[PDB]
From a paper:
The Plasmodium falciparum reticulocyte-binding protein homolog 5 ([name]) is the leading target for next-generation vaccines against the disease-causing blood-stage of malaria. Here, we examine a panel of human monoclonal antibodies (mAbs) to [name], isolated from the first clinical trial of a [name]-based vaccine (Payne et al., 2017), to define critical mAb epitopes in atomic detail.
Dilution curves of GIA-high mAbs were made against 3D7 clone parasites to assess potency. The two most potent mAbs (R5.016 and R5.004) had EC50 values comparable to the most potent anti-merozoite mouse-derived mAbs previously described (Douglas et al., 2014, Ord et al., 2014). High-resolution structures of unbound R5.016 and R5.004 Fab fragment crystals were also determined, with clear electron density observed for all CDR loops in the bound states, facilitating determination of the complex structure. R5.016 binds predominantly to the N terminus of helix 2 of [name]. The major contact is mediated by the H3 loop, which lies along the groove between helices 2 and 3. Additional interactions are mediated by the H1, H2, and L2 loops. In contrast, mAb R5.016 (from the more potent red bin) and BSG can simultaneously bind [name] in solution and mAbs from the red epitope bin interfere little with binding to BSG, PfCyRPA, or PfP113. The most likely explanation for the efficacy of R5.016 is the proximity of its binding site on [name] to the BSG binding site.
Residue numbers in the entry:
A (entry chain A): 1 to 102, 109 to 232
B (entry chain B): 8 to 24, 30 to 54, 59 to 213
The structure:
């Protein structure tokens, strides 16, 4: 039952600041240190800093010095991190990890991790997606196999979820990872391959959910001639 | 992140580019897991005692749940650094992509934009090339690609290439084509259509 529980996803504008919490459980918080590490989209890990659960003393990475502050609350077994003067490149998943019993020769490692906290930094405003059908036709049919789908376009922030026929259709489904456009809005397609003989009698509907904008869309995808 | 194509049961040795502290494993969408540390913890198939020159991680025999990315942790004057990861993917027989093309829907054409979707479905290896031609003219800088993670059932990848133009530019042209090259194809595959047809 040894675990670290972090606060929920955040969306911030450039120049603003962000605060993330890390709650310890099933162990003595005061006898270990806490490290903070971030991971930018499709990139490696970057160490941000360390704080003692005992002393409250800190060691920050040179790059973030003066911009980051780490604190602790020994009464509630919680560690906190604040990042100021936010910029687009600060968009990442932020992790806290238990780091060393409170002689670096016997380094124990970062043995317990939080679930991570997504922080998006952007000048864009919240926007629900535009859902367009990707109709099955002769151009998306070869043999007894037809491809069809939905284009889930121009939304902010991540994430969206896509299901087919209320979750009754799962085989052959591919929902692509979102790409970030120059407009600052995201876009993706969700596709499925089905027998081409089923097109006249079977109904295909994509269920799109975007909680940040409170958008739900159920789009019927109908066959098209040439 | 660097990539290694391996089979279940293979022995794998990963070198860390003494300053070594630990080895970690990270699965997609998940937080890292500690494997081995300087406390000399970790018997198991994961070991750090390869040799006394460089610091390595040996996986004695890859198991079905070992396909993830591995990275080392190092130090330099109490400032940690994480080496860049090695992603281990599962190797399988070559499979050519099934190619499909979707013209823009008339619903999108109402809204002043036109996106043309080219789908490359269930292929292996991951390396595939897609090029767009509009009225026989090669395009660059107006399309975007997305690739799925390796499929947990058939070990293949799928890719979308989306060409985006303004409706005004889209209507000034007739023929739309995507040309695909891949290891599993002896000759390139071209999927195309005429606007309005």
């Amino acid at each position: 039952q040894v675990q670290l529980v972090q606060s929920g996803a955040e969306v911030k504008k450039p120049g603003a600041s962000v605060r993330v919490s890390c709650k310890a459980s099933g162990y003595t918080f005061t006898s270990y240190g806490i490290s903070w590490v971030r991971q930018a989209p499709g990139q490696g890990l970057e160490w941000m800093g360390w704080i003692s659960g005992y002393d409250g003393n800190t060691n920050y990475a040179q790059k973030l010095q003066g911009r980051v502050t780490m604190t602790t609350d020994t009464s509630t077994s919680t560690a906190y991190m604040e990042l100021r003067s936010l910029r687009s490149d600060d968009t990442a998943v932020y992790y806290c990890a238990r780091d060393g019993p409170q002689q670096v020769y016997y380094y124990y490692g970062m043995d317990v991790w939080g679930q991570g906290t997504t922080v998006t930094v952007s000048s864009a405003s919240t926007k629900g997606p535009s859902v367009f059908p990707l109709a099955p036709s002769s151009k998306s049919t070869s043999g007894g196999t037809a491809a069809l789908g939905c284009l889930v376009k121009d939304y902010f922030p991540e994430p969206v979820t896509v299901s087919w026929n209320s979750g009754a259709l799962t085989s052959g489904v591919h929902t692509f990872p979102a790409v970030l456009q120059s407009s600052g809005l995201y876009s993706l397609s969700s596709v499925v391959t089905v027998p081409s003989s089923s097109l006249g009698t079977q109904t295909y509907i994509c269920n799109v959910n975007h909680k940040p904008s409170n958008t739900k869309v159920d789009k019927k995808v109908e066959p098209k001639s040439c | 992140p660097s990539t290694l194509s391996a089979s279940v049961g293979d022995r794998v040795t990963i070198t860390c580019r003494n300053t070594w502290l630990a080895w970690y494993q990270q699965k997609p969408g998940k937080a890292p897991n500690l494997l081995i540390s300087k406390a000399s913890s970790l018997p198991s198939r994961f070991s750090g005692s390869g040799s006394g020159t460089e610091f390595t991680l040996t996986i004695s025999s890859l198991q079905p749940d070992d396909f993830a990315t591995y990275f080392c942790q190092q130090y330099n004057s109490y400032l940690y650094t994480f080496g860049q990861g090695t992603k281990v993917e599962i190797r399988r027989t070559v499979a050519a992509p099934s190619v499909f093309i979707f013209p823009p829907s008339d619903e999108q054409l109402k809204s002043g934009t036109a996106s043309v979707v080219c789908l490359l479905n269930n292929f292996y290896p991951r390396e595939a090339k897609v090029q767009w031609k509009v009225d026989n003219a090669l395009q660059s800088g107006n399309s975007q690609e997305s690739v799925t993670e390796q499929d947990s059932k058939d070990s293949t990848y799928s890719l979308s290439s989306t060409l985006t133009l303004s409706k005004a530019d889209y209507e000034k042209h007739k023929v739309y084509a995507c040309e695909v090259t891949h290891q599993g194809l002896s000759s390139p595959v071209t999927k195309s259509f005429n606007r309005g047809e």
